[PDB]
Amino acid sequence: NVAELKKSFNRHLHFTLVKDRNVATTRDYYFALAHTVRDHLVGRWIRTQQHYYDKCPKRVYYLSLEFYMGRTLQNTMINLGLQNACDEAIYQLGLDIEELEEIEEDAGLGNGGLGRLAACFLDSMATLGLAAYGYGIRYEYGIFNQKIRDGWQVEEADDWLRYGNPWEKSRPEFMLPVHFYGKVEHTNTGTKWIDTQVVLALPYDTPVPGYMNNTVNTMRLWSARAPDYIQAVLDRNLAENISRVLYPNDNFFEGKELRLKQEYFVVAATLQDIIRRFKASKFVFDAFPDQVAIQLNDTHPALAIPELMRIFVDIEKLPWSKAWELTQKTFAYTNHTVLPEALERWPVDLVEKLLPRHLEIIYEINQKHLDRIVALFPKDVDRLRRMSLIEEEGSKRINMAHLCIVGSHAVNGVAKIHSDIVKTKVFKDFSELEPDKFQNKTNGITPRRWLLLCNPGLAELIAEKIGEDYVKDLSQLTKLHSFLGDDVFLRELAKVKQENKLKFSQFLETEYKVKINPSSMFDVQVKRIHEYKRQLLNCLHVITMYNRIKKDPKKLFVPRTVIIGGKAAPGYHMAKMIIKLITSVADVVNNDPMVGSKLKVIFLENYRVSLAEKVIPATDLSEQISTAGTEASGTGNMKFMLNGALTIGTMDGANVEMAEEAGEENLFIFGMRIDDVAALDKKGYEAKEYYEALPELKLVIDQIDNGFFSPKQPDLFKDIINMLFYHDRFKVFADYEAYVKCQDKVSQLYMNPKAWNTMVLKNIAASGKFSSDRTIKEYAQNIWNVEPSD
Amino acid sequence: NVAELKKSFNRHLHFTLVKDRNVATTRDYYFALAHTVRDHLVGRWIRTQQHYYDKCPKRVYYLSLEFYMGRTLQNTMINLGLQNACDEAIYQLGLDIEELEEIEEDAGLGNGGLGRLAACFLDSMATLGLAAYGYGIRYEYGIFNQKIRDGWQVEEADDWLRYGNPWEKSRPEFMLPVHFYGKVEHTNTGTKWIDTQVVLALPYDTPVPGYMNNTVNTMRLWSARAPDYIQAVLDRNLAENISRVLYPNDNFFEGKELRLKQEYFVVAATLQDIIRRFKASKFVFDAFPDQVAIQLNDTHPALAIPELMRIFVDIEKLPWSKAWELTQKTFAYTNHTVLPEALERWPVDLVEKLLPRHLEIIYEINQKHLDRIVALFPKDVDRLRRMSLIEEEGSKRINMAHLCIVGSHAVNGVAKIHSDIVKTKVFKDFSELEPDKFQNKTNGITPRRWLLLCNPGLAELIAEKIGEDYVKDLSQLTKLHSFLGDDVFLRELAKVKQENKLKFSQFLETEYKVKINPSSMFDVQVKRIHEYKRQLLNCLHVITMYNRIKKDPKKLFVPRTVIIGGKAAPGYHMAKMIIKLITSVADVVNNDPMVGSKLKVIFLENYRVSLAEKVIPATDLSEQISTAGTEASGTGNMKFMLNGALTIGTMDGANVEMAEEAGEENLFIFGMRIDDVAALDKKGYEAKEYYEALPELKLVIDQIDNGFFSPKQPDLFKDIINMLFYHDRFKVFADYEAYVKCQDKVSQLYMNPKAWNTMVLKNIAASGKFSSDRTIKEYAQNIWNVEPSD
């Protein structure tokens, strides 16, 4: 109740924050309130953990390098059904609640979708009452802050721990050592990884609060530290440099020794802690597969596999065959990646230098892996070097996905189509050998963070009509199909959008130099910037539109506001270049009042979960315009649907099964299918053809190359054109023409408000499958093999 | 009260530590207790600080690179009068209080006694109700941890923030920018320090309670913060590398750029924080000195004199003369040093690169300074080069002691004989010009930490016989003179010592492979290992003793336990050596079966404030045996006196002033006075003329040299024998015999329970003056010009 909440808020401001109402900052109130919000959870965290300890269900362990968690404060109140009363306590206390919430930093401990997937899974696993966890690295700087400075991506540190974190609590008694380097020794009492360097891993808890169920899971994030003088003391910095900055590589393997360290680290820490827990409970190690599932979130924690064997073989002195069994049983692999540049393939010297014992264990696991394929395909020899864990060209390297397949019991992909590819195509060699290991698990997105919270309009609207069990069991949204008729309703829906759009448009005017049209069509494309996701393909169409206003501004133009945004990797020079252009484009279209209020181009600086939380609800057109067989699933494409945005997108990623739920027409699919792509790959890309045979496109590409958007520096964008004309693996022009045509389709619909809305009500009803609650069930019944409750 | 304490202890363990009692760690227990004790101190911390802010009384600023603060939990309980009520509360929750208390890490951000002076005064300014602060660097690593591996001091990272510190509270809103390097432009709007490099200073406040008085002052410590990509992030360390480790140079100037940075870092932050606050008060800047006082704690914070002067002329745009009149008005200097290697001589090159504006001002200040003397002494050519702020000889070196004097309105030494020599001999040139500037403030120790805390026993018995007036006014301990022939009070004193002895005897028996005689005379030299302090002298007597056992193991040898402890500085090979010797001797001693329970010798591992609080209370003899006129005062000595230990020691430092109060009969003074040494330097201290002249000494030296204590490494010690014979500034031989003769009187008087005890009582009675509460009164009156209140 409000009153005792009012009290709790002040006892902290006094005792924890040492402040009078007279002198408290905006920050100080947040902490006072956050502590109040942590307080009423501690109860159900101890019990929940206590319970999973007392009773031993099979504990889940989601081991990931990335947990894109965003903001905890509001989310926890919502999930703990304490928001309303908290909002009320802060009101009576004449404080601005929004203000306090914005003080809180993004736990930007992840790059993109996989990061948010690791996050959303946490939320559900709790809301499902599953005894799950969360194993990860407590990075001191997350994903970088993105500043638009002279139309160029500028990065800054994500110094989110500068002032602190009320959500985390250190667990010193559970601190563990981790070893790096040294030599392997071969002796009589078995084999010893002698003479090694030690980094302490200090584990920090953060509560994953179930959605109104009393379950409160742990999320364990680890941090580093060490066991003339001055310099030697200063040199401890290198060990505490393993947990410092998270790597900013969305779909790109950059094999840096520090990263390699980061990997092992979060893996040795985890498996040690996990093993301790098993033995700590009411249980040799025969029982271990039944007591622990470890989901390897992608190849990233591949190193866990050889580590588990290490801890068995070298430490439990358990006999190999038996230990190699349980590792397979325990572990599983969700494969997130396709693009070859996103596959972790580690130089061996590196591994020989850093983790020599794990190289003998990878060289060993590989050995047998081939001893079987030679007793299953004796004549065949190309299959051998096609399945080995070692790629024996120039610099020899380990395939980490190969190790995860030979090391797991269930490999999966992240959406039907993608998984279909992983199984039958990408790994046709392993799958044939035992197909029952490869399965699919289509991604999701907790309707808590992404509905209840961020669009409380929609969440409430739907709540007044059809109960609120849909927040627990989301595939209830179908019950809005009965509202397809209702006049009042469609117009009621459109209101919620308009509200969202207006409040977002204010933000957009008070941040940038742009008159935002509050009744225009919101075109949004937000994610990591990448040639594969085609923000460029978008960009051209944005130019294309400008080109339709000049020739004729008097034609009734469907007024739209383009909003592209996303963090380009530092290393990714090409993506940064796409941004500059996008911003350059933005500069021509914003100021040129020949067009004026008809079309505006906003690039969203520093896009992060809390910013996604805001823009998504105020969107009309989701842009999911990747290339045939690039997007593995997307988690973002899902939200937009669940938020009243129409999706423009390719028959790629979960966009495919998104149509399979709403209907192929209710989504704007265009461009070439994975088959059409493979057809043109046979014929091979010939960029010029469309440049010749497209009276419109060519102009766009002349304006880029001549210097319409960069005059004061005409060439600049040459780099781009060289990729577009000779090296475009994602075929920007090839699907330009379908896209532009499929863009008019959307424009012509948006004229009719009563129709768009109807096509929207269809999308929002048929977004039930994409509640991450479902994914988890699937994962539960087939991979981890556990049972939900409360 | 008893009950609420219990509830908040249980309440805190529950909500802050998120533990159930079932699994709560020893450490969780401390933290809950810590937090509970803090809560009854917050309300006063806020009032105290608002009071100052409101009424605006003149504010004292102790500017120091060192606060040897120790633990806070026990002290804080004491001053809030809560120890008793918390001893009960913990007792009832079935936990052992004593145990929790040792979980706390020593906030040892100090090298030695100078470090402890800064801490002691914080306690006293708080009690004397004064509006004072303490500004220091919040070193991530304090003075290192010390282990003994194969009889050697091993350094270890004092990692005191690993687990976190409940007694600081960050101040994210009082954060300040600091500047380094760049260049100096002189412009139409005064001069400009541009192109500079930026570190941030984030302040962390700590309560400094008063002893039962409603004033809880502040101590404000600062840590450093920043304002390939992966590599750029890691490089931020370099910045935070300025608050990283405390320099372990006890009485030594190694001049490292990092330290120069530490020194500007603390000072720059300190000054700006003082100013901003003054500008925030009721108060152009002509009020300033009447509102602010900065004591300069040795030269270390010297960069302030120009730093202010920068802030004064360049920011506030004040006319030089005005800025200078005020600089000296607000800065008061404490000289702590005697040795020529512990003066801070900064090489201009360095001070050019890192702080080029401050070098300008250091020059200008010095130009006007030579102006004065040219004016008075137009023929004294050598005086100008002597009294300058620059030492032109070779690489130009800034004498920083001059910097303080010239820019302070008061320059003090720490003892009668100290300030004395500093007035007439070490600084004659300046005091002849301004005799009045130079004064004395005899050092003192805080009797809350060094009686109420580390010694309930005395504190009680005293507080039973002559009440508790004596804590706040220690000069009451003369009221104890009335009991000199009180046989029972005498016998109840020896018992307090006994228990302290026995408890501490248990400390020793559990920490070492050595049996303690419960009735041995506790002989304790605890103090940073230094040639000048002559631990080596002590050492030699330990040998001289052992031989008096060999020469006839049937003679009555008075059983004594020699306990020597201190930390050799990393650079100090000669200290680290002497340590190996003591240990070497120790082994032999505690191992020759022919002694047994006649003489035990232990080195003190990791001697620190907390561990001082143990040994000190259980001592009979305190070695205060530096070579005459090498100790400015000492503070160690002072305790032992006030814990019923008789001193044996040179007429050096404050040991003289201890004789003044108690009378020379009641100390064991020995050796040569400053003048006796002087003559032996006018004579020349030819070293070997003793090893011939004294039979016993010969044997001791021949044994250290020929290998008695070093069979395996026989020449190991040569480095010392050589130093003794050929490079002994501190004349270990010269005062040997005197010491050894003096030693007999100790051994003899000890055999007289009544005579000894009577003496011990005279000491504790006369100990009155050595209150750091009296030292404050003197500082407050004749330097800071401020009044105590409540």
Ligand SMILES: O=C(NC(=O)c1cc(F)c(F)cc1Cl)Nc1cc(F)ccc1N1CCC(C(=O)O)CC1
């Ligand atoms: O509530 C506080 N709290 C603290 O000052 C305080 C905060 C901490 F985070 C801490 F760790 C210790 C203190 Cl003491 N102060 C306060 C309350 C008022 F109602 C009016 C004035 C003040 N002043 C006190 C002096 C301060 C200064 O000079 O910097 C400014 C604020």
Ligand SMILES: O=C(NC(=O)c1cc(F)c(F)cc1Cl)Nc1cc(F)ccc1N1CCC(C(=O)O)CC1
């Ligand atoms: O009281 C707690 N408190 C926490 O576990 C706890 C501590 C935190 F610092 C935190 F931030 C969150 C929790 Cl939930 N636990 C507890 C209480 C009991 F009465 C009995 C057992 C336990 N268990 C829970 C499971 C642990 C494990 O899985 O290793 C072991 C301790």
Ligand SMILES: *C(=O)c1c(COP(=O)(O)O)cnc(C)c1O
């Ligand atoms: C959502 O997953 C999301 C992403 C990735 O979105 P896509 O899967 O590419 O659609 C990136 N950044 C944030 C903040 C998200 O919430």
Ligand SMILES: *C(=O)c1c(COP(=O)(O)O)cnc(C)c1O
């Ligand atoms: C106490 O004063 C103390 C000292 C002082 O040593 P000396 O006066 O130099 O003998 C040094 N170190 C610690 C930890 C102390 O508590």
Ligand SMILES: CC(=O)N[C@@H]1O[C@H](CO)[C@@H](O)[C@H](O)[C@H]1O
């Ligand atoms: C390496 C990586 O970040 N992979 C990403 O994984 C997420 C979550 O499965 C997918 O939505 C996305 O298509 C894919 O690019």
Ligand SMILES: CC(=O)N[C@@H]1O[C@H](CO)[C@@H](O)[C@H](O)[C@H]1O
């Ligand atoms: C350089 C330094 O730390 N000097 C020390 O200052 C303390 C504190 O006053 C004196 O007791 C002592 O004589 C001296 O060793």
